[PDB]
């Protein structure tokens, strides 16, 4: 996880890489926030009954 | 002559960003890495 070059060597399991293009991982995107929305309820449930 | 090139992340398709799911999939071995090699190997042939 130092640089993309080292990520390639760990993908192919070798210290010497040949000329070409290689796949490493996916471009995941972590979310920044979390939205929470509920209806405007005001009653409390009658669980005493 | 050629097909529509495709590629499928075997982890996201099964485990849609779930830590509990991904941790269990890691115990199944290299089933995930195999499928990403075949589809990647197929996509190269469609350019040849």
UniProtKB/Swiss-Prot annotation, chain B:
Disulfide bond sites: 10-32, 15-21
Source species, domain of life: Viruses
Function summary: Precursor of the fusion protein processed in the biosynthesis of the S protein and the formation of virus particle. Mediates fusion of the virion and cellular membranes by functioning as a class I viral fusion protein. Contains two viral fusion peptides that are unmasked after cleavage. The S2/S2' cleavage occurs during virus entry at the cell membrane by host TMPRSS2 or during endocytosis by host CSTL.
Protein name: Spike protein S2
UniProt organism field: Severe acute respiratory syndrome coronavirus 2 (2019-nCoV)
Portion of the full-length sequence here: 729 to 776 of 1273
